[PDB]
Amino acid sequence: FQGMELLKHLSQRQYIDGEWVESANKNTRDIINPYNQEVIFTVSEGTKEDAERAILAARRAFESGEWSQETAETRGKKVRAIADKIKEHREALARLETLDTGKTLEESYADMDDIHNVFMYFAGLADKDGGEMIDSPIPDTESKIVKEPVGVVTQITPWNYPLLQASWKIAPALATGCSLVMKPSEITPLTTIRVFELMEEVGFPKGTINLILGAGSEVGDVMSGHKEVDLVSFTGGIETGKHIMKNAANNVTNIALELGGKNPNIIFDDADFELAVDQALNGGYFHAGQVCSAGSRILVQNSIKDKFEQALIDRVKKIKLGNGFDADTEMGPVISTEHRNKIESYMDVAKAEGATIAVGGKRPDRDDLKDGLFFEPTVITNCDTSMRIVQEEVFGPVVTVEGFETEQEAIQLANDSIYGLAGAVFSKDIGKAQRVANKLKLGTVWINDFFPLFAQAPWGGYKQSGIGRELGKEGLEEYLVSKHILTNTNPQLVNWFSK
Amino acid sequence: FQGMELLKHLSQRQYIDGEWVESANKNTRDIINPYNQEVIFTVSEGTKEDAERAILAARRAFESGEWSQETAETRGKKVRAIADKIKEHREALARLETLDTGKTLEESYADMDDIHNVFMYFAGLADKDGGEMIDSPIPDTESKIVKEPVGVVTQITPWNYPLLQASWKIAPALATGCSLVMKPSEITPLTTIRVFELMEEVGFPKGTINLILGAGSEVGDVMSGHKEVDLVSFTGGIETGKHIMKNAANNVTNIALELGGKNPNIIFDDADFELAVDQALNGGYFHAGQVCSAGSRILVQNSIKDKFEQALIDRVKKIKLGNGFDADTEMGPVISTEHRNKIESYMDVAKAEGATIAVGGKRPDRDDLKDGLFFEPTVITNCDTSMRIVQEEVFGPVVTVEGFETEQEAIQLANDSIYGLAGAVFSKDIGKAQRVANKLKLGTVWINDFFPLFAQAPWGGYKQSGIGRELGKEGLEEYLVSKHILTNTNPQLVNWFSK
Amino acid sequence: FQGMELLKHLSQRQYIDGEWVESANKNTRDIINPYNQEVIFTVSEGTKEDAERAILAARRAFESGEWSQETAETRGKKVRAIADKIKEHREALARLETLDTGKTLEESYADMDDIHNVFMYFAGLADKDGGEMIDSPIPDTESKIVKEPVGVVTQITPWNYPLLQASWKIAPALATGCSLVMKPSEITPLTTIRVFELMEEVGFPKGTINLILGAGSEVGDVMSGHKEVDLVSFTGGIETGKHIMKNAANNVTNIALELGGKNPNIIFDDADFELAVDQALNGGYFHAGQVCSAGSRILVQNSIKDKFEQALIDRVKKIKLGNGFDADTEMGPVISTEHRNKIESYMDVAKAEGATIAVGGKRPDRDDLKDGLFFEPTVITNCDTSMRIVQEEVFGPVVTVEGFETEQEAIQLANDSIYGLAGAVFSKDIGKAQRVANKLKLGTVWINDFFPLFAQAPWGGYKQSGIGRELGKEGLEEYLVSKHILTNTNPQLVNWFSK
Amino acid sequence: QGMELLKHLSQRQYIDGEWVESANKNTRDIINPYNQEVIFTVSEGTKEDAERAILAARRAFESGEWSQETAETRGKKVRAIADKIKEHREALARLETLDTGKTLEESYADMDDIHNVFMYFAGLADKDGGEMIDSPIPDTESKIVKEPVGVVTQITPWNYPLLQASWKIAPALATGCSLVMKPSEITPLTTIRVFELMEEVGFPKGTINLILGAGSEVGDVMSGHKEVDLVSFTGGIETGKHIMKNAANNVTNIALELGGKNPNIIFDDADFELAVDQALNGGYFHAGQVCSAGSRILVQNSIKDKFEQALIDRVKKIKLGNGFDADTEMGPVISTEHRNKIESYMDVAKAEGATIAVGGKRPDRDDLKDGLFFEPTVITNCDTSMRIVQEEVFGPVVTVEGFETEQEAIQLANDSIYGLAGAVFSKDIGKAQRVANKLKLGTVWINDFFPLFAQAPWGGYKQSGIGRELGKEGLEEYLVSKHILTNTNPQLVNWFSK
């Protein structure tokens, strides 16, 4: 099959306490290629005991200090060498990801560029701020705040952008001096396995980094609830996130949650019309709409609603579907039969509550798409804010279209959801765009663009799209804890109690 | 009775959406003075629907923008007007707090001075950091982060220092423009009711501040679990904390937890001895040990242990118990019969597992204390880290004493608990105190001192003593949320999808 | 006037080392009211030995540490007391400023409000940052940066906005713990004398604050050149600033300079026309253009140029000149015969090089303005960037009008001067306003507004408009110096040199 | 000996992307201080070459190819220079030792530091664009954007040519400024090399420029030209005063890093052997030609005599020789003029009643006669009123003074026009900290001497300078703030009659 050579030397095992090792029970898992449903690889399926052992090794390593007591400058140099290795093997990593997740090759190349930059950013931030000096309000005292690594941290990622979500958590952890245990989505472990071999070549002490492979239903709880864990950085669906928070509570453990969204793409009548159409398509269908920042909820002003529906619909009929390795492919398949069915059930929900499937809504007929997990890019019209298809995250190549009369009605509709991750506003009137952006309860607002995000700036949600932040200085602040040391430079007896 | 004048004009009601109102079911509760167990006041015992009403009132107010959109400079002027009212009524407040909680009048004066200072600090911080500008990695884009108020916030406090703990939550909330709903310990609401009366006089838009009165076992779940709350700031026991975090997870709601501690007080043989004895007494018996920062776990170096034990014990026999208002009084009563019962049960625990009650460990015998909730300052010896009396937070006028041979052993013991709030180190060798300070997993560390904490510096725990911080800039950030606004100054079509 | 009452209790003396004292040689100076040219007051004219003595007192005090070593919190409380003194006495101060400088009362009330806010802003910034903790690249070392008060600072202000300019220097100086010696313009000392009376009431240690009254030509070289001066903060004309810098080099003394401006006011054809005219007038004739932030150089797009000129000209004819105390007055007189003379000489220079005096250009003939130092609001047309009238600062009620075709041309002209203090831009296309603002070499840029400046943000020049900043956090940093204290926690011999 | 390095080294200046000769074809011979022999010949630039350089910097800066490049990319480029320093570590270190005469091990320390300086600023490039202010005016957005200052001129001394050059180049490039640099006329070698290296990395035409020449011929143009936005100068105080004065003609910002009279304070409760070791190190590394040298030793009276005895006895054993020999502990001083300047101070010291306890002259040994060597010296029986104690000698010389108490030590240490760096030795850390706080110095070392790194700012209090180098503060010298205030609901004032 295609991509076969990339897998010839990849590890099938987990990585615990400095060694590549199997599952405690030698159980394994088959890895699927959503383009043809062929098994392409077989990796270990760790037990909860393996996860426990990894966590304990992380703690043991953290306490020894080899990495936590290493200078911030040096840690930065090592995070920077990881970055150099991403770029060195950019070609192989990009394919590996396309093969595992199904997105076009061009999309996977874009990630290796971001990933390189993500580690590169944190490598440079490592030695830039160790805390602060406070002007004490008590005479003859010195007051200071030192920032230390939180300790041991568990990192859990989703299947849509595996190595990308991994790097967002890995970079700051290592930059701060923490020891980490990571578990990628059970269905997309390929690139995460590669990066560990890469980090291993860079050289880290035994137990600083550990990789667990397995179902979240079996090892997850261990990772969110073990008492030696100080931080749990999770990226995934909301329900799994609530589970995690409640279990983390058993030992009052900090969390950082990066959940889903119902991201609005607000289009005013004075917008660059062809740009708005270009970006609606992009927002709704890159990686088959399996993107947490996908613009699945299009809000379009009534004056141009009709025209907008026609243009969008006509462009969607031309979207090329195929293998990610094919140069023509604009949109790939969805990740699994489970996920595909999930999306299919949403078409029945929509139809049954009053919405119109304007186009798509089914599997591709074609002779060259029948064997893959493809689903037609779709547009839903005649829907409103009370419908489940509009309120809930479908996480597929689906978008809804709602109209608004005014600027107030646009904000009202965009903020009318449990989520608050990201969104955009298209308009040539920047004063109006800036007004709107200020009233939107979103972690990230794009004015006349859709998708841009980078290490220099924090990413995360308002409301139920999350807790905490990733990337930028705040992304780093998650892996740090503050200690206030107050010295009394002229101690004196208080003499409150009798003598 | 002694403090009658203080209550002849005090309100007995809840404060919701600009009005002083009773409970939904006219239910009420009696508040007592722990020095004599006399009922001194009757207030409303509100319901969960009242709580829901407050939360909704705070939500409306926040969305109207009357406080949330007020300039940060003006918000700061009003927080400063509150600080001014604390100082203006300083006398009456300290007396009120002492009447309700039993602590000495001098301690209550100290609180009032800190409360003024807290509001003043945050009044002063309101307008200094609106967020940042990012040098964007994408040409022709403007990247910026704006810091916004988090929204509606619920604030829950303990009975030990009611107003002090309330100030730490109210000040930053207002400073940032959030709407708040507060509920103090059901047994100590007097000073909290008072400060609401004073914040009313300062002047705030309807629904911006709200006071709920009632048992947390009845109205607490609403304040932690309602979908409209954006943050729950909690200061109390660990189990209530875990219960709250699990509940807040139902709507992925931010939590800030300030829990208890098992604070070590380390005393080296090269420490100023009379200084150590003085601060060990203060650390152990201020407010009868009903203090989250109490130095309940004394670690003394073996070469001076016997000498230390007898001095400490000799001084404990001389501690003057009595009424808070009386100047000669050095230690007051404990808060309730339930809490004294809990402390009595710990003496039996200590004895059952092999420890020695070297002094105290019972009710005082004197005739004038017979009616109050007094319990003798106690010193427990011949104990170790495997015992419950050493591990668990007694929160009474009780300290345990353990020995250590070396520097490595003092630290090991100090970190051998699930907590990590605060601690102290006593030694004339400042290099050594600093080494030790750095390995101590505590939020705050005192070198040759015990207790100092002020608005200028963050406070909170490592491990299970908490999540997040109060005071300082970190404290302010719990009430703020970051939004990244990216503008494409030269938007261009991507043309990924076929035309 | 009703304002001669303001003066019956005002000090006529200098303030040195805690005492109100006369000149060393008892010399005096007569102060003038520009509306009628009458001598309203008489004060001490200090000698160069009085200045030397003031600086020596400020040094003595700084070293004793009564103020420099006081807590930052307490310093902030005092700066806050001064701010309250400004508000209490707002009325009297505003009248006094109008009496002394000729501007309207409405303008002086505005200054007093700003002034209050300046002291308040800095009171609150005082205790917010004492330095940083650095993560050292050398093992077994601690690295911290402490911010200290820079020491003794001399402060020199201009005659246009005496107290305002003084507030900008005093506030951070006292907040950071420095010692200051101030000298206001010799012709406008009234408000400055008053504010020293007020600062004395709040109470500061002897030496901390010092007031010298006198001609810069006599005592200025001592304030810039004495070796005990650590910083020299000057606000005045460019030629005096150059002289000062050169003098400060004798002892490598730090400098902060706020010089003049040739501030452009850019008006695109897509601007709100009536807003543009309103603002062009305001920027042009507030305080008879005797403003360092005055929009003297109007740049207007060609397509609306004729229409704009005519519109501006018609409005200028109606400007009402008179007494600053009369409510009908829109623009008062200029400061002195000398200053008026300078402006007049500028009308000749303009004419001889080919510009047109489209309106104004002379003293008003009117009967009630006859005895005053008035000068008609003027508009100069048919001018270009090579002309002196356009390149140089007139500092009068005069503006030059120049056309531009494109966006690049406006940017090129706006930036074609030796200056770079401030500027504005008017256009309904906010996108375009941002592009322009980015390319203007100016410390402050206004989009659709003119004159806004406040304590929360830094003010100062680019190019020859100055060195350093005033206001905001950067304003405070002028009064601080950094110290890297590096401690070696495990000192070891190097053994480079033989035994 | 180290002939091989120079074989392919450029002899010319670098202006507007071309390696070019002086306008008047003039040249200058470079010397190896160990043997006073001519090792290389370079161009002697004119002041018009300097004016041409500056005008090129201005053009490039305005064209925006570097000033408007993303901060992230600029950072990657600074990192590429960092890497070339490591790549050529060996050569550069031999080259610095050949030109300046210090030991090879010192030159290695420099290159490691130089790598880390570039690396640090490469990492700081994109971390802070400015800030959002909470405007007190309703319906207004307020933001402070940080922009590159403009054209910057950079001038360095002969003691640590490349080290001092790196402290200026790194932040300039990182922020997007354009530059024109001039090294000391006698030590231009490694600076010419670092330019050949920067050229291989790639920067647009005009961004970086190198002028070669005497400060008394081209220096005024670099401090006084009106197109210059900032003057970053590291050198002597007197030159410092001159430059500031000239820079004032166009109100041009300046950063000054000047000399010091750094105190090395030793209390009786210090680790005695640790204090003797570090006193030798602070006084004689690079033959005391270090801006951070501990030339003013202050020792508590109770151990003063003991310390003098020990120090002197150790100074007598200091190995003098060729910087290329592993045995050499101290090399020669830089030039004939600098050695005579030090000799004249010996006369001054003896004339004012001080004692030359040991050293104070050239060494006679046959193999050291052809080099610019001067014996490590120790001057006793002196006081704060004397010149030997108040002025920067910059030779291998120390002065020893006694102090009875903590206050007297503090008083003497601050009793100079300077305030750059200093040390405090004592096992009592509490005491070291009270002292550190009261010393008016840019950097204070507790129980150590010399540490300084990119992570923390370096500069002086009092007359040791204006501004800072290194750390975030050193970057801020190359940036200027712009307050952009937008009114989002403008309304007419209607002050003036319609």
Ligand SMILES: NC(=O)c1ccc[n+]([C@@H]2O[C@H](COP(=O)([O-])OP(=O)(O)OC[C@H]3O[C@@H](n4cnc5c(N)ncnc54)[C@H](O)[C@@H]3O)[C@@H](O)[C@H]2O)c1
């Ligand atoms: N906020 C963001 O930055 C962001 C980015 C990408 C994706 N997402 C979201 O992530 C989701 C991706 O889908 P997914 O199916 O991978 O998410 P998921 O919630 O199904 O699972 C994600 C990860 O959690 C693990 N897991 C499952 N149960 C667990 C448990 N009890 N304890 C611990 N771990 C457990 C899974 O094995 C997997 O590794 C989408 O909703 C998308 O919106 C968010």
